[PDB]
Structures are given as structure tokens and as C-alpha cells.
Amino acid sequence: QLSSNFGAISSVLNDILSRLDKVEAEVQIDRLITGRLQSLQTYVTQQLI
Amino acid sequence: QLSSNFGAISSVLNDILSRLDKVEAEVQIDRLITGRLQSLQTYVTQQLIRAAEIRASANLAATKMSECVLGQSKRVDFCGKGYHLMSFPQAAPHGVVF
Amino acid sequence: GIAAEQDRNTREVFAQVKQMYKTPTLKYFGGFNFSQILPDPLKPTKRSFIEDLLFNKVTLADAGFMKQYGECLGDINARDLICAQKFNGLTVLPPLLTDDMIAAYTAALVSGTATAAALQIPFAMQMAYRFNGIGVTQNVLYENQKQIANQFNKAISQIQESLTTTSTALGKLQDVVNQNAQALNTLVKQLSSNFGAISSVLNDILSRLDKVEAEVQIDRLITGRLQSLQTYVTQQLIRAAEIRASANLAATKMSECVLGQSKRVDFCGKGYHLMSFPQAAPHGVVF
Amino acid sequence: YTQHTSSMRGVYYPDEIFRSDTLYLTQDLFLPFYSNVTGFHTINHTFDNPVIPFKDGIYFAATEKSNVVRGWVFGSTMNNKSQSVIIINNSTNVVIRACNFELCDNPFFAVTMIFDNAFNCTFEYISDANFKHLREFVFKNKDGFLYVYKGYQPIDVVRDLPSGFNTLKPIFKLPLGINITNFRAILTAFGTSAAAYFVGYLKPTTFMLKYDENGTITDAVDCSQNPLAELKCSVKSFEIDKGIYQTSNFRVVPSGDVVRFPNITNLCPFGEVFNATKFPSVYAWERKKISNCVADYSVLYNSTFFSTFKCYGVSATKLNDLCFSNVYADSFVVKGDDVRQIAPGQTGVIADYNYKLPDDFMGCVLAWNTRNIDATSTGNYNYKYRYLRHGKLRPFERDISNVPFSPDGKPCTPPALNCYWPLNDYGFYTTTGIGYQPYRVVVLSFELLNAPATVCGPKLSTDLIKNQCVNFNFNGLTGTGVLTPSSKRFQPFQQFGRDVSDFTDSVRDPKTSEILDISPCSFGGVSVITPGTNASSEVAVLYQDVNCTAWRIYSTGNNVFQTQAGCLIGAEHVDTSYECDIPIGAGICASYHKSIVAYTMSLGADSSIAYSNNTIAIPTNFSISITTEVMPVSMAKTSVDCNMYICGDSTECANLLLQYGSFCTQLNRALS
Amino acid sequence: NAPATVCGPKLSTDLIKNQCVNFNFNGLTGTGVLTPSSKRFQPFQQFGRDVSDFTDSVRDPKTSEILDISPCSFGGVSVITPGTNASSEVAVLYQDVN
Amino acid sequence: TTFMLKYDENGTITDAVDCSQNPLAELKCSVKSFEIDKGIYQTSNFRVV
Amino acid sequence: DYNYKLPDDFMGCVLAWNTRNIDATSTGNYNYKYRYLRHGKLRPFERDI
Numbered sequence A: 001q002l003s004s005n006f007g008a009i010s011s012v013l014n015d016i017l018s019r020l021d022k023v024e025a026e027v028q029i030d031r032l033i034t035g036r037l038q039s040l041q042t043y044v045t046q047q048l049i
Numbered sequence B: 001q002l003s004s005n006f007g008a009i010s011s012v013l014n015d016i017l018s019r020l021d022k023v024e025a026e027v028q029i030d031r032l033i034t035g036r037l038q039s040l041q042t043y044v045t046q047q048l049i050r051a052a053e054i055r056a057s058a059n060l061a062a063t064k065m066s067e068c069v070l071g072q073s074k075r076v077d078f079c080g081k082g083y084h085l086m087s088f089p090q091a092a093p094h095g096v097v098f
Numbered sequence C: 001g002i003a004a005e006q007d008r009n010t011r012e013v014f015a016q017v018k019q020m021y022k023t024p025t026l027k028y029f030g031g032f033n034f035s036q037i038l039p040d041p042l043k044p045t046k047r048s049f050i051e052d053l054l055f056n057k058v059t060l061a062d063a064g065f066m067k068q069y070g071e072c073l074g075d076i077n078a079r080d081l082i083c084a085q086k087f088n089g090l091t092v093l094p095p096l097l098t099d100d101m102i103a104a105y106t107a108a109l110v111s112g113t114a115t116a117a118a119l120q121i122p123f124a125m126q127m128a129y130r131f132n133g134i135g136v137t138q139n140v141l142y143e144n145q146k147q148i149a150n151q152f153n154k155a156i157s158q159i160q161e162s163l164t165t166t167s168t169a170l171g172k173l174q175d176v177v178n179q180n181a182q183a184l185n186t187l188v189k190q191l192s193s194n195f196g197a198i199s200s201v202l203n204d205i206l207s208r209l210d211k212v213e214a215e216v217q218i219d220r221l222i223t224g225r226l227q228s229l230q231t232y233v234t235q236q237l238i239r240a241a242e243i244r245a246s247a248n249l250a251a252t253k254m255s256e257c258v259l260g261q262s263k264r265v266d267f268c269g270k271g272y273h274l275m276s277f278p279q280a281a282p283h284g285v286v287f
Numbered sequence D: 001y002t003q004h005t006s007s008m009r010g011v012y013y014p015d016e017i018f019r020s021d022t023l024y025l026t027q028d029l030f031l032p033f034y035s036n037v038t039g040f041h042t043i044n045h046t047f048d049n050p051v052i053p054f055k056d057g058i059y060f061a062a063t064e065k066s067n068v069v070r071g072w073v074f075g076s077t078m079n080n081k082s083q084s085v086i087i088i089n090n091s092t093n094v095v096i097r098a099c100n101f102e103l104c105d106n107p108f109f110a111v112t113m114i115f116d117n118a119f120n121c122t123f124e125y126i127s128d129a130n131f132k133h134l135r136e137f138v139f140k141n142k143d144g145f146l147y148v149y150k151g152y153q154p155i156d157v158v159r160d161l162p163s164g165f166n167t168l169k170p171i172f173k174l175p176l177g178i179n180i181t182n183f184r185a186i187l188t189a190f191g192t193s194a195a196a197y198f199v200g201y202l203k204p205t206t207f208m209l210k211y212d213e214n215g216t217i218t219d220a221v222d223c224s225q226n227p228l229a230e231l232k233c234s235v236k237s238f239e240i241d242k243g244i245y246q247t248s249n250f251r252v253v254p255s256g257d258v259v260r261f262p263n264i265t266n267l268c269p270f271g272e273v274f275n276a277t278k279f280p281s282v283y284a285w286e287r288k289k290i291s292n293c294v295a296d297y298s299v300l301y302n303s304t305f306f307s308t309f310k311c312y313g314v315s316a317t318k319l320n321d322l323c324f325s326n327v328y329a330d331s332f333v334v335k336g337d338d339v340r341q342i343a344p345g346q347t348g349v350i351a352d353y354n355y356k357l358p359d360d361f362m363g364c365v366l367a368w369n370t371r372n373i374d375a376t377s378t379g380n381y382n383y384k385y386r387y388l389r390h391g392k393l394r395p396f397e398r399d400i401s402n403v404p405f406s407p408d409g410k411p412c413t414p415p416a417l418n419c420y421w422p423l424n425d426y427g428f429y430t431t432t433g434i435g436y437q438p439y440r441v442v443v444l445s446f447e448l449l450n451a452p453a454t455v456c457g458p459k460l461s462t463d464l465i466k467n468q469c470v471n472f473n474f475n476g477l478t479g480t481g482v483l484t485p486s487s488k489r490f491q492p493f494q495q496f497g498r499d500v501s502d503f504t505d506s507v508r509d510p511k512t513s514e515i516l517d518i519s520p521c522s523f524g525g526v527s528v529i530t531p532g533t534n535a536s537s538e539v540a541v542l543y544q545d546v547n548c549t550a551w552r553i554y555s556t557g558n559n560v561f562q563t564q565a566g567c568l569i570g571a572e573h574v575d576t577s578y579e580c581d582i583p584i585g586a587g588i589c590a591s592y593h594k595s596i597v598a599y600t601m602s603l604g605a606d607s608s609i610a611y612s613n614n615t616i617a618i619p620t621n622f623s624i625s626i627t628t629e630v631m632p633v634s635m636a637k638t639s640v641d642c643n644m645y646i647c648g649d650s651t652e653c654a655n656l657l658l659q660y661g662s663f664c665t666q667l668n669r670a671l672s
Numbered sequence E: 001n002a003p004a005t006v007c008g009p010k011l012s013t014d015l016i017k018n019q020c021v022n023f024n025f026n027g028l029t030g031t032g033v034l035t036p037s038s039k040r041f042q043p044f045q046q047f048g049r050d051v052s053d054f055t056d057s058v059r060d061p062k063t064s065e066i067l068d069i070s071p072c073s074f075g076g077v078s079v080i081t082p083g084t085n086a087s088s089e090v091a092v093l094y095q096d097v098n
Numbered sequence F: 001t002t003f004m005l006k007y008d009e010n011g012t013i014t015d016a017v018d019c020s021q022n023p024l025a026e027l028k029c030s031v032k033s034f035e036i037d038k039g040i041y042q043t044s045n046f047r048v049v
Numbered sequence G: 001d002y003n004y005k006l007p008d009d010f011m012g013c014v015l016a017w018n019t020r021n022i023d024a025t026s027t028g029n030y031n032y033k034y035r036y037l038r039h040g041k042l043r044p045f046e047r048d049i
């Protein structure tokens, strides 16, 4: 699930940081942070059940 | 829940696609995808918890079939209040009656 | 749904006895001293002496479920955790059954055990009947009645001292209290987190941004804060299912260990089971 | 000026969409249920026609016969100094005109005297050529449009507004664009006949509307009428079962306003900054501090105009309500084509080597053309910029060196190979193109709502109100809460306090430097006890955090007493115990015996067992008993097609789902 | 959102009923099956929507007839296989077909 | 169309699956495997273009 | 602030073109006016004459 875009232009962090500046990268990286956090929470909930 | 906006301009996909081009539309459609996927995930989580409760009830129903219906039980209050003699099962919708 | 289930759990454990029995006024049956497990008429307290020790061992977050507006305002200096939860919309509801009512149920259960449809029988002929279920002969108890009673009275005492000191036995009851408090305090701390927005303070955003720009940032905060509530609810549902299983097993032991003699191995104690007595504890029960 | 009640009047169709057999919830300007409405009666005895305020829209109804009421006039000053709009039915057709009217004190029709003259006209519309009539209208003025709704009902009521429910329909949408705050009625005289009309005011509210199977609105529920009404809107149903329900916490609305700004009296030096005789070169840019002053900048509307204006960390419509700290101004000159480089994230000679903004910049950028002063017909060469450098500049740094440049270090003497002077001249001319014409630029920077401030916009302060819920504005920070004195101690460089939640719970008063605490106004849990709507409409309300022997309760009808669960209002207290029909809590229960009654719960039947050391009881009889036990075994099996729930039959949306990851495989594995 | 009298340059066609098609009614596009309806629109109404906010009714601009709109995809499907190793053939079960 | 490509150990594409060919092909693409175990599986709802 | 204001949620388009040839004269044209003094600000799509 680390290969999935979450509304960002790219799923690879290094690609985004290579060609975007700090402000424009901060928009895209936030989209990836929210999506990957959601993946972790789903895994934990399944483990509890 | 399909009628709720998730930060987008509209909840109707045909309305967005009619008056917004590909780049502008992609911004709104992604917002709706995130919200609608979240709705599905919440439904699945509730179903799993509900199924766990039913499974526990099913296991107890199988135990009483073996001990109350196919034999005489000495456990107090397991197969009724008084002193148990025998039991008869009867089928019901999504359940069983003893 | 969870709140309604909590009342149902308590009812199925303690409300098995249909008819309430008055507390005997002698507390000494055939050499067995039943004082310390029944209410003391001389002492005002409605609960027993053993139940007094259990309630002291468990620290409780809140005594009364009422917190007036004036009190939180008058004590702004202290960073009270309960006032903080209340000011963000989190509430705790009181249980249906009062602590005194539960103590009444356990008092009747012990009284019925010690005097018995009732079918009353002396506490001596009853213990002789129990020895038959074990496999021993009745004459064994009559010939050795005095020492058996002495061993019973000393055993009751050995339990009294253990609770007087600090014991880990009530650790499980303590755990339930701490889990509930931590979850509520985690929600209050999660209001400080930015969810991709410029700031986590709504008053700051509305002060310096117009309506159209404000909606962009406010939408982010709403999405993140709804997820916090959903995660808390899902955790509560999983905890409730665990408590329910524990409640179901407790009710089984009440029927089989307290209202009869159980021949199941290790179900009502390690040795050969004779009888059991229940005692009320905070959010639990002790056998 | 008699007072009446509008039971359920004033519902209208919200939008143009068609709905059927549904319940729809919307927020808009509605007339609340059971709201006060004034009565105006026109008869030969009395002829009522005063000026009533508009106040965000009105509800207007007329119970009359023989066509007494004819129309209205809407305006602001109601004289020939402002625009007014007249809607009248002159017995031949409906005429709408909005002009500068010379309004008459007594406007009426004769069985006409409305205005004297009319000029500076904008809109005009003409239509094709025991009371027994009720006519209802709703008026609202939004975005320059005057909306009109209409309904009709036959009545027989003698002299009062009938109760009931009726839905209005839109008939007009007038593009008038006039400022409306007053209106007056136009009534005909015969003396006068028997007629009357009523007026009510609209407020924002959330309504739940019921559409029948033909698309008609047959009923509605106002969510703010009472606790039972709020429960219906949350459950989204017109019926409620028996039991106890948890509603929202106890709410309080502010009843005041507090504005606190520091003492300033001097206008900011707009003239000395924007109109200074000399500005420096871009490479040697200068910086200046702004002392305590008032930032009005509306005086600039007379003289100074800017071709560029862009604010970054604040909205342009909020500048007049804020206070600013650590204000600095930068001045320099560039050519027209270089202005675009004065912005965060830009590249070029100006951004690289002369002047750079930070990525997280806060402030505004201003520029205006100055060719008439900074350019000469012979040519002006006093302005310079740097175009050679080793490396790029950091934000808000300057370099004023003039050391000769040679690529890759290796210092050089000016007259040598690969040796250059790092500065160039602009050379502004009178006849050159605008792309090469000079421009003056001013950059302002500051922080907001974090530290003491000495520069503020034009606003008027007020006295402090303590121990009361109010709207407050402290140096630009606004909110709602209660103010009380604090024992906290602030250091001189501290202005605001915050808690772990990051809520702002403390502030130093600017004028008096007194520390104050800020707390919310809503607090306390509530719940509603009902026996079921089908059984009754009366309910009892439990307050968990009130001690009713300044009570925080919505209303005290009767039967107020204190229980172990809280303050209960609306239930009779009985001494006998019963089987706890409805569980309230803390050993208290409620039932419907016809009023709601609250009683202590019984534990069970009581008896005494006699103990004897020589007696025993043995049964001599027996009976056979049969009992039933019910248990769930299985539940329904379901499946989901995620591509149909999401994106429906849309193709491009389906393509976006594929690019989104679409973790639908694990959803189906769980369900299977 | 409402009746419109100002329109872009575009050629109209004939109504096609009881068949899945791509439609465009006064600028609103989509896919579905068009059938006559019994709903009665008031004069100021042009579109209709259901609880999910899906667009399910429309008045024809030319003939003023009320038409119902429904999607094209419907029905459950499952696939039975004996394992790709054993065989490549399969059977298909249609739940909603008689 | 949507295709599922198979890369071998040298980086060469040796096989493929067309998810629109038939119900069995669609099942392979959803689970992302060239092998299927015996049983009955739920697939997408009947589609009309 | 004082002459012409658009609403926040505005739907439409804005057009402008240069008409110096017709609206300007060598002597100077003084037929066009604008307000620069007012008590308060205008509401969207409202005029003051």
C-alpha cells in the first residue's frame, strides 16, 4: 500500500522533494501523511479484532 | 451517506463533471473518493464486531444442544431454573428456541 | 448501546435472587463466625467489613457525577482534568444501580446461603451434606466439627490481613478505571494537532482570513477531528465486548459456585469445592 | 400595536428542485414557530401607516375584505435623497417602479396620492391589464435581489390571524440593488373599511421539511423551539419512541460586545514613506521601523493609487480589524519587467542577487509607476542592480560591496581579462516602453496575534464586561466567552496564554494591563424523557450539573425538584416504588401514570427466614414447568461493489479510483 | 439548477427511450435509461433529485414531458471454478435473472 | 483497457492478462494473481455500456 | 469599498478592454466620476447614487 497515491501527484517522497520547493511540497507530503496514517490505523484495528 | 459533501463543491459527480474541466474536476473528485472510501471502511469494521457477538451466542447455543437436549445436565440454571429433565429445540428465523 | 449494556451486565450478576432476605441477627452458626461478611447493625455502614477494605484499595477518578458551572470557574487555577473534558463536550453518566443497592443484593445472598423456595436447614447438617458431594463420609464432619470451624475462622482472618496491606489482587479492577480515564484525556490532547491546516486554533483562523479562505482551512480541521471521535468509539466497542465476556462468566459462577456445589475441576477453586460467598467491589465482584 | 402569535406560518419552498416522499433539512431565514407578530388595524376610527424597520426580512399578512391593502414602499430614508421601490396594485394591473420618489407622508388610494415627482429612475415592470381573505407574503433582500413569496387561504376569523400551516411559492426576483432598511404600507380610504395586517421578523434557523407523495410541503419542524423539537431534528423523524435520550449540552448565547485596543492617537506616516523625495537602489535597499500609529490608508484613496497589491498571510478585507506587531518597511526601485520577481519562490537577477523574500512570508507588496519623476528626457542613470555574484542571497539580506568580479574566485584588477564590475545602471528614459520604465516598491512585513502590538486599524473600544457571556475582540483576536480576573503573572514580552488544547485562555488587557481569564459559555449535560409522541407531547428534562435546591435551565414549567441524578423538571414525585419502567439513573426511574412520575426503584419482594438448630423443612408436592429460551445464531451475509458505490457509472471517476490505490480487495476479503 | 433560456451552440436529437444512452439535458450530462414518469413538476421546477442527491427526473425542454432516469448497471454475479490447475473452465451464477 | 503484466527475473515481460476478456480474467486482476483456488467468488455487478 | 462589490461566492465572468481611442481626448475628458468618501462599505451588488 506504500505505492498508492492519496490525491498527490506522486507516491515517491524523493521525487516530490526533487522538483518542488518547500511550500509546494508541503501540500503534497501532507496528502501522503494522512493516507499512510490511515493504513496503519486499519492494520491496528484488525489486529485487535 | 452518499448525499454528503466531503469538502468538495457538490456531492453529485455529474454536476462537477459538467462544468469543470479535467484538472479542476480531479481536485473535487478526489475529495469525494476519500470520504466515500471512509464510509465503506466504517461499515466493515462494525460488521466484524457484530459478527463476533453472534459467534459467541452461536457457540453457547451449540453447547446447550449437546448438554441440555442430548443429555441430562447437573449444572445449576444452565438448562432452566428448576431441576432439569429434558429439552426440545424449535427452529426460528436466524435463531433457535429451547 | 454500550451504556445500556453496562446496566444489563450488572443486573445479570447480582439480581439473580428474586426474594430479598433480612440479615440474621446472630452471625454465629454452629461454631462458624459469619461476622465480617455481613452488615454490622452497630456500624452505620450498610456494606460489610470485608467490602469496606476492597473499596478503599481502588482509586476512583470521580466520586459524584455532578460538576457545577461555578465550581469550574472558581477553581480555574487548578488544571482540573474533569473540567477540561466537560468544556469540550465529553460526559460521564452515572450507573443505574447505586453502590448501596449492590451491597444489599450481596447481603441477601450470604444470608440465604447461611440459612438455607427457602427450605431452612442448620449450618452443620448443611456442611455434612456438602461433604457427601465431595466423596467423604458424613461422620467425618460431626466427629471433627470443632477443628473444622476453627480452620474456617482462621482462614477468614488470613484473607482480612491480605486486604489490609497493599495487594495486587484488585489490579484488574484498577486497570479498567485507568483505561477509561486515559482514553478521555487523549481526546482532549488531540485538539492541539494541525491536520494539514495553518493552525489548530479556530479563533485565530477566523480572525485573519475571510470566508472563502477560512473554509479551506476549517474543512481540514473538521476531517481530522471527526476521525479522532471515530477512533475513540471503535476502541470503546472492542473494550465493551471484552467486559461483556467477563460479565457473562461471572454470572455463571454465581449460579454454579454460590447457589450450588460444582463438580467441575478448578471452576470454583483449586481444591474440592464446598461453597462460595460473593462480595461487591467497584465495577466488579469478588468470590 | 397589539401582540399576536404566528403558530406555524411562514414556510416557503427553499429551492427549485423537485422532491417527493422525503424529509429534507435546511438552514435559511425562517419565521420561528410561535413568534410575536404585531397587529395594525385600519378603520374609519384609526388609520395606521407608520414606518416599520426591515431587519433582515419580514413576514407580512393581511386579513381584510374589499381590497383595502394595496402594496408597499421600500427604502432607506423614505425621501427624495435615496432610491425607493414601490409595488402597487392599482385596480388595473401590478406596477413596480424603483425611483427617487418624493414620498408623501400619507400615501393612499382614493375610492391616487403616492408621490409627487420621480427622477433618476432605474427599474420598471408592468403586468398585463368577518374577514374572508388571507394573503401572505415573505420579503428578503440578498445580493441585490428582492425575493417575494406569495400564498392565499380562505378564512372566516373576525379580527385575528388564523392558526395553521401554509406553504408559500416564489413569484418575483427583482434586481433592484437598493439599500433597504424601512418600509410602509399603502392603504386605500373610502374614512376606511374594516381591514388589518400583521408583521413578523425572520431569523436564521434550521428547519426539517416534509414532502408528500405529490411534492407538496405539508409539515415542518423547527429545531430550535424546544428540547423535543431538537431531538426530532437529530433523529430525523417525526415520531419518537418511549425512553430517555441524550441531547446537546446546555447552550448560552452572548449578550454583549467588548472591544479593547491600545491608546493610539497618531496616523501612520503614509506621506513620508510613499511620497519621500528619494528612494534607494535595489541592491542597497533600506529598511524602516513603523512606530505606534493608526493604519487607516483610506486617506490614500484621494491621492495615491497602486498598480500592484498582494497580501500573503492575511486577507485584504481583514486589515481594518487587526493589530500588527514588529512592522517594517522596505523601499527600492526596479524597472517594470522586474516587479514580478518581488514575490516568494521567484528566480531571476533581482531575486538571486539583490532582494529575496522568505518562503513563509507574511505581509503585503506594493508598487506604482513613477516615470514622471524618476525619468528624464536626457536619461537618468542613478539606479543600479547587481548581476554578478558567487552564490545566491538569503532572505532579507543585502550586499553593498563593489569588489571586481572574476569567475571562479581568483581576484583580479579591473583592467584585465575575465575581470568585470558587478553592477549595472538602469538608464530610465522618458520615451521608453513601459517594460523599461521605473517603478517604486514598498514591502511591509509583520506578525499577527502572537505578541504585543502597537499598530492597529481604526476601531472604537468599549468598557469591559465581566462575569457574562459576550463577544470580545482583544487586539484583533475575537471569540465568545466569559471574562474573569486572573491570578496568573505575565512577563513583559508575553501577551496571550494558552492551555494544552491550544485554546487561548488568558489575555492582558491593553489599556489597563490587567490579566483576564477566558472560559466557554456552554457547559452541562441534558437529557429528555418522553412517553412517546403517539401517547403525549409533554416531556421532562433532566439536568445533570444543576443543583435546584441563577439556575442554568431552559425553562421551569413546574415539578422542579432535586434527585440523585440531577435537577428534574416536569415529573411528579411519588413515594411508592415500582418496577422502573424507564431508567433515569442513580436508583431513580420514570413512568407514565396522566402525567410523568419519578420514583425510587424497588429491589424485590422482602421476607425473613427463621433459623433453627433443630428444624428442617421437606417438600411433599411437585409440579412440572416448561420455559423457553431464545438465542441468535446467524446474521445476514452482504457484499459490496466498491466501483458502483463510488463513481457509479462514471468512467473518468473510475480511472481516478484506479490511480488512488483503491484498497477494495481487503474490504471484500473481510466481508467474504 | 433551474429553467434556462440562454444556451450554447449545439445540435439536438430525438429522444431514445428504454435503452442505455449518453444524455445531455440543458447541459447536465450522464448515462442511464430514460422512461416516462408520472411525477408532476410545478412550473418553476426543472430537475428532480432523490435522497442520495442523485438526479432521477428531468423535464424535456422541447415537449415539457417528465422523464425518469435510472442507471444501467444492476444485478449480482459470482464465478464458480474448479481451480486453474485442474481446468480453465468456469460457471457463472446470475442472482437476479429468471 | 486494463492489463496485468508479468515481469520475469531478467526484466522481460513474458505473460499478461486482459481483465476485460471474460469473468475469469476479471477475477485474476482483482486478486492480482495468475493462479486461482477452487471455490466460488463474488465479482462485479452486471455491466451495460 | 464604495462603488462596486462582488459577492464572495460569485459565479460568472469578468471582461475588460482598453478604449482610450474613444473615451479619451486631447483636451481631457471629465465625464466619468467615482466616489471616494462614504460612511461604511457597500454590500455586494448594491449601488449608491
Ligand SMILES: *[C@@H]1O[C@H](CO)[C@@H](O[C@@H]2O[C@H](CO)[C@@H](O)[C@H](O)[C@H]2NC(C)=O)[C@H](O)[C@H]1NC(C)=O
Pocket: D390, D391, D392, D393, D394
Ligand atoms: C557570507 O560571506 C562568506 C565569505 O565570503 C561567503 O563564503 C563564500 O561563498 C562563496 C560562494 O559559495 C565561496 O565561493 C567562497 O569560497 C566562500 N568563502 C569562504 C571563506 O567560505 C558566504 O557565501 C556568504 N554568505 C552568503 C549567503 O552569500
Ligand SMILES: *[C@@H]1O[C@H](CO)[C@@H](O[C@@H]2O[C@H](CO)[C@@H](O)[C@H](O)[C@H]2NC(C)=O)[C@H](O)[C@H]1NC(C)=O
Pocket: D076, D077, D179, D180, D181, G039, G040, G041, G042, G043
Ligand atoms: C443603508 O442606509 C442606512 C441609512 O441611510 C445606513 O445607515 C447609516 O449608516 C451610517 C454609517 O454607519 C450611520 O452613520 C447612520 O447613522 C446610519 N443611519 C441610520 C438612520 O441609522 C446604512 O449604513 C446603509 N447601508 C449600507 C450597506 O450602506
Ligand SMILES: CCCCC/C=C\C/C=C\CCCCCCCC(=O)O
Pocket: D268, D269, D270, D273, D290, D295, D297, D300, D301, D306, D309, D319, D324, D327, D329, D364, D366, D444, D455
Ligand atoms: C508607513 C505606513 C505603512 C503602513 C503601516 C503598516 C501596516 C498597515 C496594515 C496593513 C497594510 C495596509 C496596506 C496599505 C496600502 C493600501 C493599498 C490600497 O490603497 O488599496
Ligand SMILES: *[C@@H]1O[C@H](CO)[C@@H](O)[C@H](O)[C@H]1NC(C)=O
Pocket: C028, C033, C035, C036
Ligand atoms: C466473630 O468475629 C468477630 C470479629 O473478629 C469477633 O469480634 C467475635 O468475637 C467473633 N465471635 C465470637 C463469638 O467471639
Ligand SMILES: *[C@@H]1O[C@H](CO)[C@@H](O)[C@H](O)[C@H]1NC(C)=O
Pocket: D080, D081
Ligand atoms: C428633494 O426635494 C426638495 C424639496 O423640493 C428639493 O429642495 C431638493 O432639491 C430635492 N432633492 C433632489 C436631489 O432633487
Ligand SMILES: *[C@@H]1O[C@H](CO)[C@@H](O)[C@H](O)[C@H]1NC(C)=O
Pocket: D090, D091, D092, D093, D095, D126
Ligand atoms: C394603473 O397603472 C398603469 C400603468 O401606469 C396605467 O396604465 C393604468 O391606467 C393604471 N390604472 C388605474 C386605474 O390607475
Ligand SMILES: *[C@@H]1O[C@H](CO)[C@@H](O)[C@H](O)[C@H]1NC(C)=O
Pocket: D119, D120, G049
Ligand atoms: C440625478 O438628478 C440630478 C438632477 O436632479 C442630475 O443632475 C444627476 O445627473 C442625476 N444623477 C443620476 C445618476 O441620474
Ligand SMILES: *[C@@H]1O[C@H](CO)[C@@H](O)[C@H](O)[C@H]1NC(C)=O
Pocket: D212, D213, D214
Ligand atoms: C396527490 O394528487 C392526487 C391527484 O390529484 C390526489 O388524488 C392525492 O390525494 C394527492 N395526495 C395528497 C397527499 O393530497
Ligand SMILES: *[C@@H]1O[C@H](CO)[C@@H](O)[C@H](O)[C@H]1NC(C)=O
Pocket: D302
Ligand atoms: C482630496 O484631494 C483634493 C485635491 O488635492 C482636495 O482638494 C480635497 O480637499 C481632498 N479631500 C480630502 C477629504 O482630503
Ligand SMILES: *[C@@H]1O[C@H](CO)[C@@H](O)[C@H](O)[C@H]1NC(C)=O
Pocket: D263, D510, D511, D512
Ligand atoms: C489608556 O487610557 C486609559 C484611560 O484613558 C488609561 O487608564 C491607560 O493607562 C492608558 N494606557 C496607557 C498605556 O497609559
Ligand SMILES: *[C@@H]1O[C@H](CO)[C@@H](O)[C@H](O)[C@H]1NC(C)=O
Pocket: C066, D547, D549
Ligand atoms: C445542593 O445544595 C444543597 C443546599 O445548598 C446541598 O445540601 C446539597 O448537598 C447540594 N447538592 C450537591 C450535589 O451539591
Ligand SMILES: *[C@@H]1O[C@H](CO)[C@@H](O)[C@H](O)[C@H]1NC(C)=O
Pocket: D620, D621, D622
Ligand atoms: C400434589 O398436590 C396435588 C394437588 O391436589 C395432588 O393432586 C397430588 O396428588 C400431589 N402429589 C403427590 C405426589 O401427592
Ligand SMILES: *[C@@H]1O[C@H](CO)[C@@H](O)[C@H](O)[C@H]1NC(C)=O
Pocket: E061, E062, E063
Ligand atoms: C420547440 O419546437 C418543437 C418542434 O418545432 C415544438 O414541438 C415545441 O413545442 C417547441 N417548444 C415549445 C416550448 O413549444
Ligand SMILES: *[C@@H]1O[C@H](CO)[C@@H](O)[C@H](O)[C@H]1NC(C)=O
Pocket: F008, F009, F010
Ligand atoms: C535470464 O538470463 C539468463 C542469462 O542468459 C538466462 O540464463 C536465464 O535463462 C534467463 N531467465 C529466463 C527465465 O529465461
